[PDB]
């Protein structure tokens, strides 16, 4: 098993610790943790390309989708849901991201957005790029667990 952590920080109050674990080099990745400082609602949650306003991590050159869509970016992890006091519990199992190999998400940037991801079902081309999720509230590099 390979383990990773991203520490989400932003310019506002949004912060959190997100864990990743992958038992087999080609097995599903479990993603979990809590994000605080939000407001009640749905917020886009993706792996972005940045390592060093960049696009979603997309090594296979696909269009944007929800996590369970046949057409999606590798980074497309959908939405997290925060309650009235601004806490979202993240618990995701994903088959497309990986922590090893040619397309490993290690070193890329995890992002939580200001608004909801429309899962590529929106009425414009932007929907097929970013899900119309808007600006970033918090981000953090995905690093191998120390
Ligand atoms: Cl980016
Ligand atoms: Cl907005
Ligand atoms: Cu995003
Ligand atoms: Zn995407």
Swiss-Prot record:
InterPro entries noted in UniProt: SOD-like_Cu/Zn_dom_sf (IPR036423), SOD_Cu/Zn_/chaperone (IPR024134), SOD_Cu/Zn_BS (IPR018152), SOD_Cu_Zn_dom (IPR001424)
GO MF term (any one): small GTPase binding
Modified residues (N6-acetyllysine): 115, 129
EC code: 1.15.1.1
Species in which this protein is naturally found: Homo sapiens
N6-succinyllysine: modified positions: 3, 9, 84, 115, 129
Coiled coil: none
Outcome of mutating residue 37 to R: In ALS1; mild form; ubiquitinated by RNF19A. Ubiquitinated by MARCHF5; leading to the degradation of mitochondrial SOD1
Pfam families assigned: Sod_Cu
Record-given protein name: Superoxide dismutase [Cu-Zn]
CDD domains for the chain: Cu-Zn_Superoxide_Dismutase
Subunit structure: Homodimer; non-disulfide-linked. Homodimerization may take place via the ditryptophan cross-link at Trp-32. Heterodimer with SOD1. The heterodimer CCS:SOD1 interacts with SLC31A1; this heterotrimer is Cu(1+)-mediated and its maintenance is regulated through SOD1 activation. Interacts with DAOA; the interaction is direct.
Cofactor binding note: Binds 1 copper ion per subunit. Binds 1 zinc ion per subunit.
Result after altering residue 73 to S: Destabilization of dimer and loss of zinc binding
Outcome, altering residue 73 to R: In ALS1; sporadic form; interferes with zinc binding
Residues the record lists as N-acetylalanine modifications: 1
GO cellular component terms, A-Z: axon cytoplasm; cytoplasm; cytoplasmic vesicle; cytosol; dendrite cytoplasm; dense core granule; extracellular exosome; extracellular region
Keyword Ribonucleoprotein: no
Note: The protein (both wild-type and ALS1 variants) has a tendency to form fibrillar aggregates in the absence of the intramolecular disulfide bond or of bound zinc ions. These aggregates may have cytotoxic effects. Zinc binding promotes dimerization and stabilizes the native form.
Disease implicated: Amyotrophic lateral sclerosis 1: A neurodegenerative disorder affecting upper motor neurons in the brain and lower motor neurons in the brain stem and spinal cord, resulting in fatal paralysis. Sensory abnormalities are absent. The pathologic hallmarks of the disease include pallor of the corticospinal tract due to loss of motor neurons, presence of ubiquitin-positive inclusions within surviving motor neurons, and deposition of pathologic aggregates. The etiology of amyotrophic lateral sclerosis is likely to be multifactorial, involving both genetic and environmental factors.
Primary localization: cytoplasm
Enzyme class at the top of the EC tree: oxidoreductase
Keywords per UniProt: Acetylation, Amyotrophic lateral sclerosis, Antioxidant, Copper, Cytoplasm, Disease variant, Disulfide bond, Lipoprotein, Metal-binding, Neurodegeneration, Nucleus, Oxidoreductase, Palmitate, Phosphoprotein, Ubl conjugation, Zinc
Record PTM Phosphoserine, positions in chain: 91, 95, 98, 100
Cofactor field: Cu cation; Zn(2+)
Family: Belongs to the Cu-Zn superoxide dismutase family.
Function: Destroys radicals which are normally produced within the cells and which are toxic to biological systems.
